[PDB]
Structures are given as structure tokens and as C-alpha cells.
């Protein structure tokens, strides 16, 4: 309940934010649409621009967002724009910015596992300067992927199966239901991003204060997900792509205690999946072992493919 109570705090806190700018969205005037238009535009383009080429230019995007969010004018498409246009706008850009970070993790990071690190650092860095934005990220991240909390949605009475899948995070149109494979990746990329944000820090800025969402949240995530019965394909998948991304940073921090966790899932939690998963869905559970057999004997968990290196930061 400690987690579920905290889970609700962020969710209903976001719902408060949905309402604070209520009227900016719900407006049909030609100006009122244009203002909503230019803001949602000049607040999500830079996030989509995030690239792996070089941190040298990854600072432009970071500065362009800090300026936008801090109130400064930003060079948008054609005319420059700021938030001073509308007083209920600030609380709106913070909402659209937060979702886009998870959205970029939904689509890109799912497809491209390496783009997780150049996106996270910017997210982890903006989280520092403006904490209210981070709660909004944790809000969306949690809803779209409840497995990040982590908490598994239970099956309430009345078998509205279509209604249940929606809670599981499946995206279903009135007529259409999402495939598992198009869904699994959507959730991988969401927790590969989360696993990256908790270990990365914005190098620039001279901040003597610590990470807003620290690597402690990675330990609890592994602890709290391994103390409950695993789902068939979801767990054995998400457990893997979380360790590949953050397993290196956890091994350095909790040197022995972490290893204890790993020697458990390998001999104690692996049997917990062999029975649950059917023979037609063992794909994930197999990667999960191929991941440990190396790491367990090698005494080392490889650096996540795509980690930002010293060269990237100069260029």
C-alpha cells in the first residue's frame, strides 16, 4: 500500500493538473486554438530531435526546453513564442512535455533500445531544475505502463475482458485490440527509459544537489517485482530489459547485495516461471537465462549497448 498510496498521489495530482489549465484545451476560438497549437508544438519538437550524434548538440535541446519552461522566449517555427501569452499555459506545457518523454520512450526506445540514454539524460536533467515536471512524468509513465510502479493489475469481478486489457495498458480502439508483440515492445521501451533515467545525470549545470529520482528506485523495483508471482510473458521480458539497461549501475552500487538478488532469480525465481509460462510463450524466459549465465559466471554485467561515452560528450 506504501507504493499504491504513492501511486495514487501522483495520478490524482496529475488529474489536478488536467484541471488547472482546463479551458486552454477546451477552447474553440481561432486565437485560443492557435496558442494551444504553438505551445504544444514548440514544446515537443525538441524532445523528438533528441539524437545519438553528440552531446555537443544535445545541449541545445536542453537549453531550448529550459528557456521555454523558465519563461524565456524560444525560437519556434517562424515567430518566437513564450508562455507569457497565457497564464494557464505554463501548467499546460509541463503536461505535454512530460507525456512526450514517455511517448518518445513508447515508440522510439521500443524500436531503438540505444536511444534511451540520450533521451533520459535530458529528462533526468530537467527533472533536477523543475521537480513538478518529474511528477508529471511519473504520472504518465505509471498509467501507460503500470508495470513500472511496479504493480500488476488484478482481475476484478465481472469479466469485461476488453475492459481489463485496457487497464493492462493495451491500446484498444472501440473495434480494435492491440497485439501482444506490438504491446510488449511498447512496454519494454517504457521501462528501458525508466531504467536509464535512474542511473544517468546531466553532466553540465553545476548542481551540487543529488538525482531527483535516485537509483534506489531501481532496487525496490527489482525487489518488489520479484516478491510477487510472475506473469507469464510480461515479467520474464520486462525483468530482462531492465537489468540489461541498469544492471551495470546496480552492481557497482550494491556490490554484494545485488548479486544475492541475481543468484535468487536464477535458482529460485526461474522455477517460478517454467510452470506459469506455456510452451508457446517461453521466448522471453529463455533470453532471461541467456542473460544471467554469462553475467553470473563473468562476475560482470555488460554496459548497456548505447551508453553515452566520453567522446559523445565532447562530440
Amino acid at each position: 500500500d506504501i507504493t499504491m498510496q504513492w501511486y495514487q498521489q501522483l495520478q490524482d495530482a496529475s488529474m489536478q493538473c488536467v484541471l488547472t489549465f482546463e479551458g486552454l484545451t477546451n477552447s474553440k476560438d481561432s486565437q485560443a486554438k492557435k496558442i494551444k497549437m504553438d505551445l504544444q508544438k514548440a514544446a515537443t519538437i525538441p524532445v523528438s530531435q533528441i539524437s545519438t550524434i553528440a552531446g555537443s548538440k544535445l545541449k541545445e535541446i536542453f537549453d531550448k526546453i529550459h528557456s521555454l519552461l523558465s519563461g524565456k522566449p524560444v525560437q519556434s517555427g517562424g515567430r518566437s513564442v513564450s508562455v507569457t501569452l497565457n497564464p494557464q499555459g505554463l501548467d499546460f506545457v509541463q503536461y505535454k512535455l512530460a507525456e512526450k518523454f514517455v511517448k518518445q520512450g513508447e515508440e522510439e526506445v521500443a524500436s531503438h533500445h540505444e536511444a534511451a540514454f540520450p533521451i533520459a539524460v535530458v529528462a533526468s536533467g530537467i527533472w533536477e531544475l523543475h521537480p513538478r515536471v518529474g511528477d508529471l512524468i511519473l504520472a504518465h509513465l505509471h498509467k501507460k505502463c503500470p508495470y513500472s510502479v511496479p504493480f500488476y493489475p488484478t482481475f476484478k469481478e465481472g469479466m469485461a475482458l476488453e475492459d481489463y486489457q485496457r487497464m493492462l495498458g493495451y491500446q484498444v480502439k472501440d473495434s480494435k485490440v492491440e497485439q501482444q508483440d506490438n504491446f510488449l515492445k511498447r512496454m519494454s521501451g517504457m521501462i528501458r527509459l525508466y531504467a536509464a533515467i535512474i542511473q544517468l545525470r546531466w553532466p553540465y549545470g553545476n548542481r551540487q544537489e543529488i538525482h531527483p529520482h535516485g537509483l534506489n528506485h531501481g532496487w525496490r523495483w527489482l525487489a518488489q517485482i520479484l516478491n510477487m508471482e510472475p506473469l507469464s510473458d510480461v515479467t520474464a521480458t520486462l525483468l530482462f530489459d531492465f537489468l540489461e539497461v541498469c544492471g551495470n549501475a546496480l552492481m557497482k552500487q550494491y556490490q554484494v547485495q545485488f548479486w544475492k538478488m541475481l543468484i535468487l532469480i536464477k535458482e529460485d525465481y526461474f522455477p517460478r516461471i517454467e510452470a506459469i509460462t506455456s510452451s508457446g510463450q517461453m521466448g522471453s524466459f529463455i533470453r532471461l537465462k541467456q542473460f544471467l549465465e554469462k553475467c553470473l559466471q563473468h562476475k560482470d554485467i555488460p554496459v548497456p549497448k548505447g551508453f553515452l561515452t566520453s567522446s559523445f560528450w565532447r562530440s
Binding site: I210, N227, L264
Partner: protein
């Protein structure tokens, strides 16, 4: 003018005895992994 400190680890104190005995064990016990991070004293156990 103050800077807060880190919560990366959990103090040895302010930790229940269950969690303390778990971190100290050579092996963890299934379904009873402590939610709080480990302490700095029992890192190299």
C-alpha cells in the same frame, strides 16, 4: 544555504530486524527481499 544529503542507501538504524537479517544472509529468501535499499555497512558482506 543548505544542501540535503543522499538516500541512495538506507541507514543501518531505522531499519527493521527482518531486513537487517536478510542483508546479512549469504542467500536471500524468496518473497522477502527488503524494499528499502541496503546499508553502507553491509555492502561487501
Amino acid at each position: 544555504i543548505i544542501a540535503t544529503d543522499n538516500v541512495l542507501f538506507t541507514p543501518r538504524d531505522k531499519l527493521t530486524v527482518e531486513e537487517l537479517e536478510q542483508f546479512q544472509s549469504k542467500k536471500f529468501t524468496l518473497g522477502k527481499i527488503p524494499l528499502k535499499p541496503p546499508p553502507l555497512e553491509l555492502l561487501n558482506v
